[PDB]
Design a protein around this nucleic acid. Structure first.
Ligand SMILES: [Mg+2]
Ligand SMILES: [Mg+2]
Ligand SMILES: [Mg+2]
Length: 89
RNA sequence: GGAAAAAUAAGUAAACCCUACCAUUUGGAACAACAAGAAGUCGUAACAAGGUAUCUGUAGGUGAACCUGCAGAUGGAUCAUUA
């Protein structure tokens, strides 16, 4: 019964020292399209919604604002502070 | 007959109040705003034709620098080619 929402925040190296923040685990409820926008202006970086495996929708922005995002999804509510994961090396 | 107090009207007009307006100073705050700086963060606009150019005006859009349409100017990557 994995109904709960488990959000994964990834941090990838896409070039020398340039990083990527990845957010996967956002319920389809609210379309990312509108979170793509806000996050772009929020952190000031380019976003992209990547969709691997037909159903799973992922937000892939450049940087490393995981600290921000978790603080964002929680403060907002779209994701309870507990269920949010920070896979950070 | 002179003549003190008192009282009188018009007058000069102190102060005071109300109604407008001027001048000179001085005041004010969270959030906001502005100023300056950097190997903060994201990208790369501009110089190099700096990915096939900048730039002016106006218009519209955009995380950001900016892109794009129409019209110009070279301060351009031409001072030049009917045989
Ligand atoms: Mg700077
Ligand atoms: Mg223009
Ligand atoms: Mg404009």
């Amino acid at each position: 019964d994995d109904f709960q929402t488990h959000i994964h925040i990834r941090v990838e190296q896409r070039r020398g020292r340039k990083c990527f923040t990845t957010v996967e685990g956002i319920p389809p409820e609210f379309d990312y399209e509108k979170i793509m926008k806000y996050w772009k202006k929020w952190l000031s970086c380019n976003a992209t919604i990547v969709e691997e495996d037909e159903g799973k929708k992922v937000i892939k922005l450049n940087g490393d604002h995981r600290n921000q995002i978790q603080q964002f999804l929680s403060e907002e509510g779209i994701a309870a502070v507990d269920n949010i994961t920070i896979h950070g090396i």
